[PDB]
Amino acid sequence: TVYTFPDEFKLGAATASYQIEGAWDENGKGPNIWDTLTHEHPDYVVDGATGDIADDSYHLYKEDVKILKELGAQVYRFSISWARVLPEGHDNIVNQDGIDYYNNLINELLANGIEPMVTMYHWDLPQALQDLGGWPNLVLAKYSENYARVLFKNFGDRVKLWLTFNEPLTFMDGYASEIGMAPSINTPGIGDYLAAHTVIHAHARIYHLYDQEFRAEQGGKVGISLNINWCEPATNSAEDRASCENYQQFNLGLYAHPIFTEEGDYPAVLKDRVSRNSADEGYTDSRLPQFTAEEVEYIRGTHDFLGINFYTALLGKSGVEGYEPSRYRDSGVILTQDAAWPISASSWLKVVPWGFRKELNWIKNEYNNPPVFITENGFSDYGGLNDTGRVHYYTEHLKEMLKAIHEDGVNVIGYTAWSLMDNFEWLRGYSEKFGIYAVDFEDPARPRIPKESAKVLAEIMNTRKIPERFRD
């Protein structure tokens, strides 16, 4: 039993638009902040790589569906490129080519028995909106509502699973470094918090929009994909446990407390630590933006499920480090990695499968066991088809998730592996491979070929169980 998936549980794979599509300026698509970063700042990216072509999924979407069908995916999580649909960011111009493209993909999926799950925003903000300041500027919440309306109107008759945002904890960091994630702005501890605030408002507007204008007719579900690392106490002390709770609240709680709790608002520890630090540094005003009571009420409850991206764990101990000001310094935890944990091709990603189970329990307890869809989980290497590290990563993480479901009563409802295929890995370019299918980026045809992990995941999806040879 502990090795069998629940009958209704949905298994599949995931991608994101900038990472796979290419066709960056084709057929009316407007420029986004990743076009800007990779074109103007190739020095920020391994190999000076760009997403100009990537997997060429704009042209090769039928090949993506073919490999999903081979895999036996029940669900395909993909994102929509805002600037492909609304090239000016604002809703004055709708690019019919973009509408046609995503309709083509959706219809191809459905014709092949695969359910679409759509992420509205996976980091590719139109440059015209970044030019207003991007996410730190609250005007983007209404622009996001208007973008979502176009998506619901055009696609919501066939799409029943939506994610407003992917990893705002990550993309807010594009406002906390001059050389990092797009738009590569250095306002740590100030602009990243403003970005988070706008995102939360935008998410809430989109959810309410769905309720008001679409739900009765379309009958789907709207969630959000939040990333979180497990944070294990470095020692068993109460002090180290406190630091790990700080981590959860400063990483997951930043977004999930306003949305997924009965109380709403930011976590108290977030408000209090930033207020104190801001005062001690001489600011008249806290660096953390505030919600009014009316806003708190509007934002809380804006969810039909919780999307989780899970990859790894850290060790946390009591203390403070990082630059002043910064979210890390504000969070009041000293983070490290255990040298014993297996490595990947990504400095940040160590293999800690039991951390997945711990995180799922933390979520269950904090948010009253919301339905959780694992929207990403995966592993990097530098290349190769005999990807034993990736196979082990998946089988162990899936076993831990199944224990969370069956032993711990966590309401996990689905899982999409990151990623269907090797793709543009942001600042790492094509150097770090996350796919279960390999792609030859030197071959203009971009063939997708199965790795061992694709074969093992197909076996899992077909049999609906963890095969005996991978059991403890």
Ligand SMILES: OC[C@H]1NC[C@H](O)[C@@H](O)[C@@H]1O
């Ligand atoms: O870093 C791996 C993977 N993690 C999370 C992101 O959502 C995805 O875009 C990225 O490729």
Ligand SMILES: [Cl-]
């Ligand atoms: Cl066997």
Ligand code: NA
């Ligand atoms: Na329209």
